[PDB]
């Protein structure tokens, strides 16, 4: 996994094509004096801008994109379909035809529709998969076959949402799939190696959020942790690592503390604590773990 964000804002890859099969090359980020995004005004990164032609996202778009060579046909920029750019919990986009929908369940329409509102609408009714299309949709379901109409390209399903303007809400006749596990408070996690997001991950986290993520594995030796994404700019809210046998605290992370990229614990009953505040909320976490058997 390379993209731990719903729009691919943190994507540092070396794909200098728009698509790997039947694509046109991307222009360099230093040969683009004509357009307002180049390294001549954004040095030292600013989304990732060096002397390359990689598919970045500096403007807060719904997907990574590059500058294509203008062939006197209008469009001078295309979306880059990155196969290894999907947050764990994003199944992909699929087609939507008619009276049999891909997700047999309840539906909801709204004038403000982000990813997390639909995920919470599908989760508060005990459904497994979420889904949305054309900006205003929320299709819940529990069926194991949601690909009955085929899988579509990720560049096709990049219509913007309504409550937020940096998230892709599928497209016209194209539904984007999500799991209901992302952005929740707590879950009996017993898989081998999963990901844990903060509450209301595609949005900002709410005020007064506190939950318990329990990690139990059937007899592994030790667990391995990692912290791909971490952005909290306040001194009140904090993440903790707890032990549930005699209730001792392993580690205490804060906004002013830079956490290590990886460390080890020889335990299998890990507890996660997260006390929110009421003053400032910017972004959550994307803790990825792995258990060693």
């Amino acid at each position: 996994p390379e993209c731990f964000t719903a729009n691919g804002a943190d994507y540092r890859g070396t794909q200098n094509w728009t698509a790997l099969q039947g694509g046109k090359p991307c222009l360099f980020w230093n040969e683009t004096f004509q357009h307002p995004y180049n390294t001549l005004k954004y040095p030292n990164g600013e989304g990732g801008l060096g002397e390359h032609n990689y598919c970045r996202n500096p403007d807060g778009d719904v997907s990574p994109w590059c500058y294509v060579a203008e062939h006197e046909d209008g469009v001078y920029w295309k979306y880059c379909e990155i196969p290894a750019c999907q947050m764990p919990g994003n199944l992909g986009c699929y087609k939507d035809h008619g009276n049999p929908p891909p997700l047999t369940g309840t539906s909801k329409t709204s004038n403000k529709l982000t990813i997390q509102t639909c995920i919470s609408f599908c989760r508060s009714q005990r459904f497994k998969f979420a889904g949305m299309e054309s900006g205003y949709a929320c299709f819940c379901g529990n069926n194991p076959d949601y690909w009955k109409y085929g899988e579509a390209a990720s560049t096709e399903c990049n219509s913007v949402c309504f409550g937020d303007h940096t998230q892709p809400c599928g497209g016209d006749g194209r539904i984007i799939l999500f799991d209901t596990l992302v952005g929740a408070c707590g879950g009996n996690y017993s898989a081998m190696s999963s990901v844990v997001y903060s509450p209301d991950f595609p949005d900002t986290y709410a005020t007064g959020r506190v939950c318990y993520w329990t990690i139990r594995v059937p007899g592994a030796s030790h667990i391995h942790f990692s912290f791909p994404l971490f952005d909290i700019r306040d001194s009140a809210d904090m993440v903790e690592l707890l032990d549930g046998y005699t209730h001792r605290v392993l580690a205490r992370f804060h906004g002013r503390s830079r956490p290590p990229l990886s460390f080890n614990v020889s335990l299998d009953f890990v507890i996660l604590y997260f006390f929110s505040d009421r003053i400032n909320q910017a972004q959550g976490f994307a803790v990825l773990y792995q258990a060693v058997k």
Partner: protein, 246 residues
């Protein structure tokens, strides 16, 4: 016999001493919706006094480096008084307006203003971006300024891409400080539908733009305000429900 006038609507009256003749927009007086053009079934309400009077907005100081101001008339007096209260509870709305813009000075000041109405005065975004994700769009206080008002950034293109020079095709009037000190425009209901919501759609907008700059010698008065009053002539309302804010 013509430079004097007293406009009385309801419990309000506007007296003047230096005035031109009143401007009647497109030769049509504001009238009630006829039964042939109507499409709703519920009976509309007609207060005829409490919503038909001259509401006076705030005053704005006209400096030397001023560019201009604009309003949205079914939005300015949308929160003030019985007209606003009656317009928040109902869903349909139809009315005309009587306009009056005051700007007096001495016989030593010079300058001229242009007050006119623009039906469907859509505000244009300012920028050179064609991507849908970064194309600039105006905010809610820029599109619907409220009872305060909004200023112009490029009044030469009316902040809409349309030149100010050709804006004399609209119902207009000049305020020349050597001739008069007030301007009056009566406007009927202009829409492609009989009734319409007075919250999600402004029919037209008033605009005051000083084309001739304000100039005076050192020693005279320096506070020159612009005062505007609005009379909702022939108001009708329908579709009664709970009161909404916006």
């Amino acid at each position: 016999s013509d430079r004097v006038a007293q406009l009385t609507v309801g419990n309000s009256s506007i007296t003047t001493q230096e005035a031109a003749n009143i401007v009647l927009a497109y030769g049509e007086w504001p009238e009630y919706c006829p039964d042939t053009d109507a499409t709703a079934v519920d009976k509309p309400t007609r207060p005829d006094v409490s919503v038909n009077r001259f509401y006076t907005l705030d005053s704005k100081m006209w400096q030397e480096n001023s560019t201009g101001w604009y309003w949205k008339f079914p939005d300015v007096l949308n929160k003030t008084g019985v007209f606003g209260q009656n317009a928040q509870f109902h869903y349909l709305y139809r009315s005309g307006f009587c306009l009056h813009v005051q700007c007096n000075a001495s016989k030593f000041h010079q300058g001229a203003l242009l007050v006119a109405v623009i039906p469907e005065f859509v505000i244009a975004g300012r920028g050179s971006n064609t991507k849908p994700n970064e194309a600039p769009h105006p905010g809610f206080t820029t599109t619907f300024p409220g009872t305060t008002g909004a200023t112009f950034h490029d009044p030469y293109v009316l902040d809409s891409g349309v030149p100010l020079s050709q804006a004399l095709i609209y119902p207009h009037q000049w305020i020349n400080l050597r001739t008069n000190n007030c301007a009056t425009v009566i406007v009927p209901y202009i829409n492609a539908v009989p009734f319409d919501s007075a919250i999600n759609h402004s029919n037209f907008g008033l605009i005051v733009i000083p084309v001739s700059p304000l100039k005076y010698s050192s020693g005279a008065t320096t506070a020159i305000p612009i005062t505007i009053t609005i009379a909702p002539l022939n108001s009708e309302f329908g579709g009664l429900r709970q009161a909404v804010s916006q």
